[PDB]
Amino acid sequence: GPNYCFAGKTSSISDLKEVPRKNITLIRGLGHGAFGEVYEGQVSPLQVAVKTLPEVCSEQDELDFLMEALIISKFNHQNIVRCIGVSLQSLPRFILLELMAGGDLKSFLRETRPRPSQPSSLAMLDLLHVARDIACGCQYLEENHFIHRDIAARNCLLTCPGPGRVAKIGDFGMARDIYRCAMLPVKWMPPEAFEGIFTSKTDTWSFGVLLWEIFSLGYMPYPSKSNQEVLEFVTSGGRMDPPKNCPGPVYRIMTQCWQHQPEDRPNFAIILERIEYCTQDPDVINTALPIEY
Numbered sequence: 001g002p003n004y005c006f007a008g009k010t011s012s013i014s015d016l017k018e019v020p021r022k023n024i025t026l027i028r029g030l031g032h033g034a035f036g037e038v039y040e041g042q043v044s045p046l047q048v049a050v051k052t053l054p055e056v057c058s059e060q061d062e063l064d065f066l067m068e069a070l071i072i073s074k075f076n077h078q079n080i081v082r083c084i085g086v087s088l089q090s091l092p093r094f095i096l097l098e099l100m101a102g103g104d105l106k107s108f109l110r111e112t113r114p115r116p117s118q119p120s121s122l123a124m125l126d127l128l129h130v131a132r133d134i135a136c137g138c139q140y141l142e143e144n145h146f147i148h149r150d151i152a153a154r155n156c157l158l159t160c161p162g163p164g165r166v167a168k169i170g171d172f173g174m175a176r177d178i179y180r181c182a183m184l185p186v187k188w189m190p191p192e193a194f195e196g197i198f199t200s201k202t203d204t205w206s207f208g209v210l211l212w213e214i215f216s217l218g219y220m221p222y223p224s225k226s227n228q229e230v231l232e233f234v235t236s237g238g239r240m241d242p243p244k245n246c247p248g249p250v251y252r253i254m255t256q257c258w259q260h261q262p263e264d265r266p267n268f269a270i271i272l273e274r275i276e277y278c279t280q281d282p283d284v285i286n287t288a289l290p291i292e293y
């Protein structure tokens with residue numbers, strides 16, 4: 001029976017909000033992936049997402065699922081998905097999370113690119129608001145000494161597709177694994193991560209790559225380079241060019257997050273200030289996004 005510690009506070013299985021099974025109904029499948037497996041559900045009525053643990057699973061799998069529930073249950077911030085509760089005493093086991101109907105950010109960006117059929121589907125301001133949303137979640141993690149270890153568009157969710165959408169950090173799998181190779185998010189990692197010491201400046205680095213994902217509208221970073229090619233490229237001083245039509249001031253935020261030395265990268269409070277500035281600059285927000293023909 002593991003304990004989990006966050007912000008100086010210790011908690012364990014008995015501290016999770018166990019929701020009676022009978023109160024939980026699955027509505028439909030949403031999908032599966034590195035994050036595990038998730039459904040839309042209802043509680044009691046409260047609409048939720050439901051993550052599930054396979055009944056056929058290892059002991060470490062069980063401990064992983066428990067630790068996921070502990071980690072997410074202890075965060076308290078408007079840009080990190082909430083945990084409504086858990087159902088660990090019935091099988092298959094469930095973790096109940098805030099329903100994020102816009103789905104993951106990477107897919108939303110790819111699917112919502114301006115096209116002749118939808119030429120104003122996104123504007124710079126939409127992208128800067130997503131960036132600000134995730135920076136605010138990261139600033140919370142930084143201030144609570146929690147290193148995320150995989151800040152990327154694939155790990156962010158949106159409340160809804162339309163106007164008023166709020167982005168939130170939706171996955172903590174890597175952090176869970178280290179709380180405790182080919183799968184490592186190499187394209188998101190700074191040179192120093194290859195002494196292997198992490199800090200919140202490693203998350204600053206990763207946030208710069210997420211900014212590149214956002215302002216490229218969902219491209220894979222380092223187009224054409226493999227993991228090892230990226231590693232050698234960034235270690236040598238190599239950096240991505242700005243995404244298509246990216247305003248200079250937004251690209252300058254990326255390039256400061258990618259300073260070789262970690263002390264030279266901004267903390268998330270500074271990143272936020274700089275995103276706020278870009279957001280107020282008419283020349284940035286009046287810049288047209290590219291049309292994908």
Ligand SMILES: CN1CCN(c2ccc(C(=O)Nc3n[nH]c4ccc(Cc5cc(F)cc(F)c5)cc34)c(N[C@H]3CC[C@H](O)CC3)c2)CC1
Nearest residue numbers: 030031032035049098099100101102103104155156170171
């Ligand atoms: C058109 N498009 C509209 C949005 N729709 C949705 C809506 C909600 C969701 C969805 O799961 N919403 C969630 N609401 N609350 C959640 C909490 C945890 C997770 C797991 C997760 C976290 C994450 F950061 C990224 C993920 F893709 C999946 C997911 C959710 C969804 N999920 C797909 C994402 C694509 C992935 O490959 C398979 C799971 C898709 C997909 C279809």
